[PDB]
Amino acid sequence: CYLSRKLMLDARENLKLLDRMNRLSPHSCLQDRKDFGLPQEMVEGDQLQKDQAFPVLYEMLQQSFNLFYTEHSSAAWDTTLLEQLCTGLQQQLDHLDTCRGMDPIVTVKKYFQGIYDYLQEKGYSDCAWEIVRVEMMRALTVSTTLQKRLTK
């Protein structure tokens, strides 16, 4: 796709924004353990067809955007980083769509459902969110490695 390189630059910039916001997080929440069962497997061995890679990456990003959009819907009044991250994720989704013309996808949807359920069971607390954003650094990292495969 003519946006291959642009897509990798979108990913790198979203990862940068998410890392910076996590590092500036005003909370000293406890690193107290937590596992979200991210199917890292997908891109760790490239165990999927290209026609399967694309829909899985698109789902990862759409869900990532929905989640940060929801965080934004309730974050502090001027969290400019969160806004930029949402904007950068939407931009990446738009580029992937320009490039356009279920089991693994279901596995992604379950992973993200476990995220919302965790947020729900914690009443969307400030620390429930810091924990989820650190997990999101993992989800965005694996989806970036997958995007590379579709690219390279």
Which amino acid would we find at residue 32? D
The H-or-E segment that residue 98 falls in is helix 80-99
For 25, the token pair is 């997080």
- Domain limits, the chain: 1-152
Cβ atoms 3, 54 nearer than 8 A: no
CATH of domain 1-152: 1.20.1250.10
| Sign for the pseudo-dihedral over CA of 28, 33, 34, 38 | positive
For 34, the token pair is 């937590």
> Which of 58, 23, 27 has its CA nearest to residue 128?
27
Cβ atoms 113, 39 nearer than 8 A: no
Helix axes 126-151, 4-23, angle to 10 degrees: 160
Resolution in Å, one decimal, please.
2.1
